[PDB]
């Protein structure tokens, strides 16, 4: 059957206000890993290993994500942890991954600025997802021309996110007429809705960073205060999708916007394949998404290192995995040299049905820019962990 096991550590919220988006990441991270093991597993030195894992709850609780990390690193010994999404989370992370030159895979769309050596990144960063959206709003949404109103979960992922939307959009020669943050978890949305009320008196564009379940009361409140898209009224959204959509109710959407890198709507063999083996795995009701093909493709890309470094230890499997290509979901992704993934950057409208009818699309895959080129901090810079004399930041 098997020669042995690896086991791999998996690090996720199941509890607290970040669950209705991280709960449906660990199923989809099992299904890479029952797929590979149905597949005869993971091949090193002639070996054949099974893979076997380690669910731990960071409980929407940064400083338990770090508790947590100390313990399948230096305890269960993984040679890799899946998890992750609010930058948050992946900050408290960082020190300790970095401090005993571990690895963390981190599958969610985040703001960059940001080049870790023990954390490889399979989400969108901004040039992947806000720098396209942004455009897209202010040139082609029904609102095209019309300002933007920022509203986002108090963190650095909004607040890193919207300083680089305000730089695009100035060169852009539009206009910010609000910037709100409520704390995470936080359902008030009144305060915020009466701003938007009177900074958009004619409609236009609200940039939405809200992370976690405190956006089912934003999206059910916007709407019975009449901020709608038959009233000019039109969400772009960064930190939710089929999942969370499905959670809220497609009628709280539909008319609204996303920006993805992988959406369920895509029309290919391996977009279809991924979402009926999902349902056939979990249940009828259950979407695939793009924070859950990100989480999918980490689990092949490890798996592909592995197999070409002949080893699971982390130091040689870091090394290897710049270069891995996937078929994914989305079609095909690369590992770069920043340890970001290269994907097709997709523009979509939400249905009556709870998908994105796809509007706009690269002709193929972006480069990953880890480094910010319209924020001023880190204008010129990059990242390339293959080469001495570059690393983290460099000109
Ligand atoms: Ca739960
Ligand atoms: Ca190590
Ligand atoms: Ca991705
Ligand atoms: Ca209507
Ligand atoms: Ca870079």
Known sequence: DFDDKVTVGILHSLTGTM????????????????????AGGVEVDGKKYKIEYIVEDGASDWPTFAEKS??????????????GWTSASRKAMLPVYESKNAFLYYPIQYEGQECSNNIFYTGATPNQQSEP????????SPAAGKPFFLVGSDYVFPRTSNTITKEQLASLGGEVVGEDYLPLGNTEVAPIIAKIKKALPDGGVIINTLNGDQNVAFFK?????????????????????EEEISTIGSE???????????????????????????????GADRQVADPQESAYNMVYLWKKAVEKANSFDDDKVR?????????????????????????????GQITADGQFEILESTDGPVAPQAWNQFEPSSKGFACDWTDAAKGEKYK
């Open 19 to 38: 669950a209705i988006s991280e709960s449906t990441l660990v199923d989809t991270e099992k299904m890479a890993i029952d797929e590979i093991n149905a």
């Open 70 to 83: 100390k313990k399948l690193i230096d305890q269960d010994q993984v040679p890799v942890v899946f998890g």
């Open 133 to 140: 959206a942004t455009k897209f709003m202010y040139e082609k």
């Open 221 to 241: 409140q916007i709407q019975d205060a009449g901020i709608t898209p038959d009233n000019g009224y039109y969400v772009m959204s960064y930190s939710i999708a």
């Open 252 to 282: 709280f959407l539909e008319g609204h916007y996303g920006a993805w890198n992988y959406m369920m709507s895509i029309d290919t063999p391996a977009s279809k394949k991924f979402a009926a083996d999902f349902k056939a795995k979990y």
């Open 319 to 347: 090394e290897v995995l710049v270069g891995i290509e996937f078929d994914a979901p989305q079609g095909p992704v690369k590992v770069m040299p920043n340890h970001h993934l290269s994907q097709t950057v997709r523009i």
